[PDB]
Every structure is written in C-alpha cells, then in structure tokens.
Amino acid sequence: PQYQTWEEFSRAAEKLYLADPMKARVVLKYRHSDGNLCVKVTDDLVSLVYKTDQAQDVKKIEKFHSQLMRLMVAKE
C-alpha cells in the first residue's frame, strides 16, 4: 500500500529488501510537470509505496535509494 509517513516507509522498505535481496526491486518515478516523486519497493508479494510533492523528501528518497544500492553491491 501507500505510506504517508516517510520513516515508516523507510523502515518497512528496508526490512522487505533484507528479507530477500534478489527478489526485491526499487523503483523511482519523477514527473517534473506535475511536481511529484514516487518511490516503491516490491518483491511482487507486497508493494510498498511512498508518493510525495514535498521537496524535502527528494534528499530523503535519494539517500534511501543510494543506501539500498550500497547494500546490493556488498558481498555476503
């Protein structure tokens, strides 16, 4: 579902990734014309979504996206 609280999404999204890294995907969608940004983490069993039009969330979403990328390339 959609999350209205960022930190709540962040925590659930990270949990979902860690549960099975290979099954997860992280998707960003940016619409300049509409002035909104969307981030999703899904493993095709659940879809965690955070949608925003607040500029402060861009840094939050970018760091989030960045952190998950670093985890993906860290060898077990």
Partner: protein, 86 residues
C-alpha cells in the same frame, strides 16, 4: 540499450531534460547476479539500474568497484534534476 555506468549518467541527465515539459522518468534498481539467460558463477557485488520514459531505455551495471564514483555523480544528478517539487 546497455552502456557503461558513466555514459548511463549522461543519458539519464538527457532523459530528465527531455521529460521536463511532460512525461515520467522511471528508474529501477535491483541486485544483479550476472545471469545472461533464463534460470554459471553468480555475482554478489553487482546491481543493475534501468531508466526509461516508457519509450527510450538505458541500462547499466554497477559493481562494488565503481559504486563510490557512481554514487557521487548519481546522487548529485538526482538532486539537481528533481527540482520541481514544493
């Protein structure tokens, strides 16, 4: 099409620019194990990125060996191009 991570960043910038007046920029990030056929030696230090406006597609693979430089440019790219929000 697939390309080196550095060219991906250049083409990603162009995609954002093309979709400034209209359209969505999609970016997908996943862990990548090096497979090239349906399901070798699986890779454990790589991810893939894809970007598209739904018509044009670009993709790359980023390894632990290039993640630092890639992150630096990529994070800067995202912050600079996603400037339409309030």
């Amino acid at each position: 099409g697939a390309m080196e991570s550095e060219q991906f960043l250049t083409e990603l910038t162009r995609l954002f620019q093309k979709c400034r007046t209209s359209g969505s920029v999609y970016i997908t990030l996943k862990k990548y194990d090096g497979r090239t056929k349906p399901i070798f030696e699986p890779a454990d230090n790589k991810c893939l990125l894809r970007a598209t406006d739904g018509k044009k597609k670009i993709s790359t693979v980023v390894s632990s060996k290039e993640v630092n430089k890639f992150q630096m440019a990529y994070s800067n790219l995202l912050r600079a191009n996603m400037d339409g929000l309030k």
